[PDB]
Amino acid sequence: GFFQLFRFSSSTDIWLMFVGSLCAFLHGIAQPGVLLIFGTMTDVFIDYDVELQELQIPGKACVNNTIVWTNSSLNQNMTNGTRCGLLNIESEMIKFASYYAGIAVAVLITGYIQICFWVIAAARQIQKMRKFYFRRIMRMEIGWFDCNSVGELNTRFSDDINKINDAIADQMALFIQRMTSTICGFLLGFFRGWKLTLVIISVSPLIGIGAATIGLSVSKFTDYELKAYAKAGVVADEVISSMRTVAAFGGEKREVERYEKNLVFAQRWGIRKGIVMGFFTGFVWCLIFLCYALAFWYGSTLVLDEGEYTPGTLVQIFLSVIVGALNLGNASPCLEAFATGRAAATSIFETIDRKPIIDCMSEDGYKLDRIKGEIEFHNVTFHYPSRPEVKILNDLNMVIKPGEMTALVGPSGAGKSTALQLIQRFYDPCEGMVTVDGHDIRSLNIQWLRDQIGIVEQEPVLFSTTIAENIRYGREDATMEDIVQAAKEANAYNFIMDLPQQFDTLVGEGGGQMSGGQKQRVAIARALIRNPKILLLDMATSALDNESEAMVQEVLSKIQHGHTIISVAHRLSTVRAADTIIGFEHGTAVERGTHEELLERKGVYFTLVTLQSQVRRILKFSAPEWPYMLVGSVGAAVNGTVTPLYAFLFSQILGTFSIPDKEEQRSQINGVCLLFVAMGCVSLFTQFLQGYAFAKSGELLTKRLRKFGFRAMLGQDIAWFDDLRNSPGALTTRLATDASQVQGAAGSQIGMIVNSFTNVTVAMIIAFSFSWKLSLVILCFFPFLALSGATQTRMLTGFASRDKQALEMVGQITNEALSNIRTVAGIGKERRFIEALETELEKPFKTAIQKANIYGFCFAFAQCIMFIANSASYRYGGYLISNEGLHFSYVFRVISAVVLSATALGRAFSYTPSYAKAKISAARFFQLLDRQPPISVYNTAGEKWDNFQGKIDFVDCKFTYPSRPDSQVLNGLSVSISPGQTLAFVGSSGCGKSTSIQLLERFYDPDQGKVMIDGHDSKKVNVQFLRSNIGIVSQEPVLFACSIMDNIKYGDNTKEIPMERVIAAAKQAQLHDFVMSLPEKYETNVGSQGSQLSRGEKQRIAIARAIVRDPKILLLDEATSALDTESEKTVQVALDKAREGRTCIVIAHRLSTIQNADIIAVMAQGVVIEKGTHEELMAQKGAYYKLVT
């Protein structure tokens, strides 16, 4: 439901929410209830004006004035009784500035009570929710985490509770205002004008639709639009991910052709936002003005013939229906944010109440003492909750006698530690209970059983605080006198002193991490500090370095003894001196004997050891966009001068109820109400054209800015694609967002400084040409009224982003306590990681109690400054009409021209994608748009005409990675060769041999050591020739998302794409049958959805790709990287057949690749050592001579 969002409401918060919604009702009645004053005011003027104008002439009243000039002072001589000084303006406007500025205190002390009493009363519940959700994540099973992610529960803790801090906080408080000035807006019409506020409310739906889908559509056309781009969003991050290969063949000029074409699906999905949000602010201003035509014309029928309405009753019951139906369509952007909250909190409310299978809590269980540790395995069967079909364990029958070690030898991965996770109960066995010295492990205290065991994981993980209190996390009672004994035993004793400081070191996660074989020496001390009765080590030496490998084995083999240890073996020569080895092949322990017990048999480990123990620019860049920023701007003056002109038509009609002669009004009031229709054919025609041509010009820029962007982003070097500041994660999510913040510097910004420049300076003509004296008073409020329309938005969105940097501190303690949940629940308790959330969840509560009372006073004072502006004015306005000759009609004109052109300064002013975040957003693009790269395809392109003939040479080539400074100098190397021959590098696997031939591809550059072609200076040979006459194949497979032929099509970049080698390269590269063994011929889509062919299958495309070409140098850079013993073998024929015209460098990392091709030059430092052939490495050391050694 919806009133389930308030489920966590306490009693101090259901009372801080009633008086914050009594004073929200009682605010919303002000704005259509202030027209009651304004409608008995434009009538008290107009009776003063009628008598004063009739006082002027001595016409029909020949021998007299009416009662004026001593007829009400004589002996009862009042022939009419009314025309006197009996209406005094002095004594009357002091009585309508009392009222009009007594609302502006009780709309100031109840607009800081409707918004400082809800945003307290929401952020006092989301503290109680977010704290309570996390208390019952940490009690779920382990297997519940195995089917719910950790990077997804970290979004449903911060980005999905903050979607129900909008359906409670102010969008409830700002809705029981905007739906009680509709119930009190329209119904305050039917109180008076029941036959006139029906001929207006019969057009009130057709404004109530249009005011809705202005505010609602901007919050709807974001994700409606953000996904129409992303068809381009893969073609960008395909190539930028696969950048080596597209630049391997030179196919760059036809790789903006897949990004010139495929961009138009958002080139016309953002035009279409310009109409639909620009036409609809015309179709409220075509409907207000035409409603004024139908209210004034039809209303002037009644007010003149019946007399049943008075002229102040007539401007009061349609200015209560306009502001009565503005809010009803301005509460719909506030009722979208309930159905967003109500439908995105059903995940949280389903996690709070599942009541898990195993608590990891204390009370509900059974307690046992003096534990021997008779560990038992009765006949289990066991699925995962992730993969529920595979049977990991089957009828597993084995015992563990207490006091000694016990091994576990699986083949590779059958029951390695899944058998062992049950003894600490991360999973219940579905059949076959297991028992511990009598009583079983189910129906016992989880917080007692998890005290006795002690786990040592595969990979170490350490928590963020001090290493002397990280070991404290097991056995909470222990002190520094007792901590120090375990770090002694677990080899941290020299790591006391070599460490920067003695036992306070934060940098276990904080400053700088230790080595992978070193954190484990902490984790042994963590499990040993608790005085455990069970040790459980599951591949402690799984993946760590060979030095401390043998060092931590000394911790376990030589030192560790005394009680029950259930262990496994990474290598079993360590456990060769132990008690029992109960290894198995599948789910059932078979052997249970020592190594001499399986000398006589085969079993599970004797079988194993037979084979293992052997600013001006943005305009000038948009210079072809001149007709769509001048007919877009002529259409932005002529509806910027509509608001100021309206103040002159509306205040014209209001003086024309005062003229005495009856035929003149019905002629005159029918004249001015005809002008409102003509301002309904204009201010829709030019509110269309101010939202169309400023959104073709903001979309014919950002289409041509992307295509120029991706011609330069493609045509640069590899040396910064691998750079840290711009990786392909950020080099394609820049190009989506930053290309859209660059329309807001040219297109829709000249529709602001000429919208709100003709809006203001035609208002100051009207405001000063009629009475300058009354326009000094009100213009003293022109700063406080325009600038207050856009100072809460710049406050608020700069004050959600100070919550985020107060809540990212919470997103630390979460993510270090869900990503490693198997180590939290295994060691002691998670009480510590619950209790360290309440202490960190006060801190985003103190910056949402300071979004109460600085979003009170920027919202109360943003709303009583236009009710005090109508009180300093008309107080002084009454001073003018009485003793000066400023007649009545000019006071509604001076005031409606500098309030309507003050709000529509700011209201227009917040339609700006901010100019400061475009110039700092365009400047991060022009440097890309004109960068000078060190080597380039778009450079001097005429140094060629050398037929290669395989005389390619090295002379002592040094090399660096300038983007990854691991070393500083790779050693020089000098190799020359003859055509049709092989260099055949084998040697250093780390930056030694593949890198020294990926250098030969012009991807990186020689640090020194000039290479040659035919005595040529290779940097003075252009890349378009040189990169054409070669051909590579990648180590790892990476192709496109196209079909089979479309990558063999891709084998040339400029040349005539062959169909005659489609037949030949299929049979030359071993795939002429595999292209036929598929059910289809060409439609085998290789990346998108069709076939997830294996690495041995997928490479067979790639050898076929370059073999269509006619190159001089082959680059067989580490193929046959698959262990698939026939797919590895079959592809070897492809590398061996492609010869005879190929000056190759085929590496032969393994023995199966050919060794008798030619010489070997490289070695461990990248030095030309042992230059001779295969038959010369027998005297000295060799690679084959090392693997036999």
Enumerate the known binding-site residues for ATP: 410-417, 987-994
The least distance separating ligand TCH from the CB of residue 40, rounded to whole angstroms, comes to 12
Q: Is the Cβ of residue 608 or residue 900 nearer to ligand TCH in the bound state?
A: 900
Question: Bridge-partner residues for 455, per DSSP?
Answer: 536
The least distance separating ligand TCH from the CB of residue 322, rounded to whole angstroms, comes to 4
The least distance separating ligand TCH from the CB of residue 755, rounded to whole angstroms, comes to 12
Say if residues 865 and 788 touch (Cβ distance below 8 Å): yes
Beta-strand runs (E) in 310-446: 375-377, 381-382, 393-394, 398-400
Q: Is the Cβ of residue 744 or residue 789 nearer to ligand TCH in the bound state?
A: 789
Encoded tokens for 87: 């209406």
The least distance separating ligand TCH from the CB of residue 207, rounded to whole angstroms, comes to 9
Q: Is the Cβ of residue 35 or residue 453 nearer to ligand TCH in the bound state?
A: 35
Say if residues 695 and 278 touch (Cβ distance below 8 Å): yes
The least distance separating ligand TCH from the CB of residue 183, rounded to whole angstroms, comes to 17
Residue 518's identity, in one-letter code, is Q
The least distance separating ligand TCH from the CB of residue 319, rounded to whole angstroms, comes to 5
The least distance separating ligand TCH from the CB of residue 643, rounded to whole angstroms, comes to 3
Distance in angstroms (rounded) separating the CA atoms of residues 767 and 774: 8
Per the document, the length of the chain is 1189
Q: Is the Cβ of residue 870 or residue 1053 nearer to ligand TCH in the bound state?
A: 870
The least distance separating ligand TCH from the CB of residue 648, rounded to whole angstroms, comes to 12
54: CB partners within 8 A, 6+ apart: 66, 83, 660
Q: Is the Cβ of residue 282 or residue 410 nearer to ligand TCH in the bound state?
A: 282
Backbone angles phi, psi at 307, to 5 degrees: 75, 5
Give the closest residue to 170 by CA, choosing from 130, 109, 108, 116.
116
Say if residues 665 and 311 touch (Cβ distance below 8 Å): no
**Residue ranges of the binding site:** 410-417, 987-994
Residue 425's identity, in one-letter code, is R
Q: Is the Cβ of residue 100 or residue 229 nearer to ligand TCH in the bound state?
A: 100
Q: Which spans of this chain sit near ligand TCH (rule: CB under 6 A)?
A: 31, 34-35, 38, 285, 288, 319, 322-323, 326, 643, 646, 866-867, 870, 900, 904
Helices (H) and strands (E) in the chain, counts: 56, 9
User: Of all helices (H) and strands (E), which one includes residue 839?
Assistant: none
Residue 226: alpha-carbon gap to chain centroid: 12
Q: Is the Cβ of residue 99 or residue 384 nearer to ligand TCH in the bound state?
A: 99
Q: Is the Cβ of residue 320 or residue 567 nearer to ligand TCH in the bound state?
A: 320
Backbone angles phi, psi at 961, to 5 degrees: -95, 105
The least distance separating ligand TCH from the CB of residue 854, rounded to whole angstroms, comes to 24
Q: Is the Cβ of residue 242 or residue 871 nearer to ligand TCH in the bound state?
A: 871
Encoded tokens for 329: 């369509």
Q: What is the DSSP letter of 572?
A: T
Q: For residue 873, count CB atoms less than 10 angstroms from its CB and return exposed for 0-12, middle for 13-18, buried for 19 or more.
A: buried
The least distance separating ligand TCH from the CB of residue 871, rounded to whole angstroms, comes to 9
Backbone angles phi, psi at 1031, to 5 degrees: -165, 130
The least distance separating ligand TCH from the CB of residue 118, rounded to whole angstroms, comes to 23
The dihedral region occupied by 1130, where left means phi > 0, alpha psi between -120 and 50, and beta the remainder, is alpha
N- to C-terminal Cα separation, the chain: 74
The least distance separating ligand TCH from the CB of residue 700, rounded to whole angstroms, comes to 30
Give the closest residue to 272 by CA, choosing from 692, 738, 751.
692
Q: For residue 885, count CB atoms less than 10 angstroms from its CB and return exposed for 0-12, middle for 13-18, buried for 19 or more.
A: exposed
Q: Is the Cβ of residue 692 or residue 867 nearer to ligand TCH in the bound state?
A: 867
The least distance separating ligand TCH from the CB of residue 646, rounded to whole angstroms, comes to 5
Q: Is the Cβ of residue 232 or residue 868 nearer to ligand TCH in the bound state?
A: 868
Say if residues 114 and 31 touch (Cβ distance below 8 Å): no
Q: Is the Cβ of residue 208 or residue 744 nearer to ligand TCH in the bound state?
A: 208
Handedness of CA 554, 557, 562, 564 (dihedral sign): positive
Beta-strand runs (E) in 470-547: 534-537
Give the closest residue to 456 by CA, choosing from 539, 512, 389.
539
Q: What is the DSSP letter of 365?
A: S
Say if residues 1006 and 970 touch (Cβ distance below 8 Å): no
Q: Is the Cβ of residue 38 or residue 112 nearer to ligand TCH in the bound state?
A: 38
The least distance separating ligand TCH from the CB of residue 91, rounded to whole angstroms, comes to 21
Distance in angstroms (rounded) separating the CA atoms of residues 561 and 554: 12
Q: If you search the block for the tokens 């294996």, which residue do you land on?
A: 1094
Give the closest residue to 575 by CA, choosing from 453, 419, 404, 393.
404
Distances from the Cα of 133 to the Cα of 779, 805, 818, angstroms: 53, 21, 13
Q: Is the Cβ of residue 334 or residue 572 nearer to ligand TCH in the bound state?
A: 334
Residue 479's identity, in one-letter code, is T
Distance in angstroms (rounded) separating the CA atoms of residues 1138 and 1135: 6
Q: Is the Cβ of residue 186 or residue 646 nearer to ligand TCH in the bound state?
A: 646
449-477 in b/e burial notation, b at 16+ Cβ within 10 A?
A: bbbbbbbbbbebebbebbbbebbbbbbee
Helices 271-278/662-692 angle, 10° precision: 170
Q: Which alpha helices (H) appear in 1030-1148, and where do they start and end? A: 1045-1048, 1060-1068, 1074-1077, 1095-1107, 1127-1137
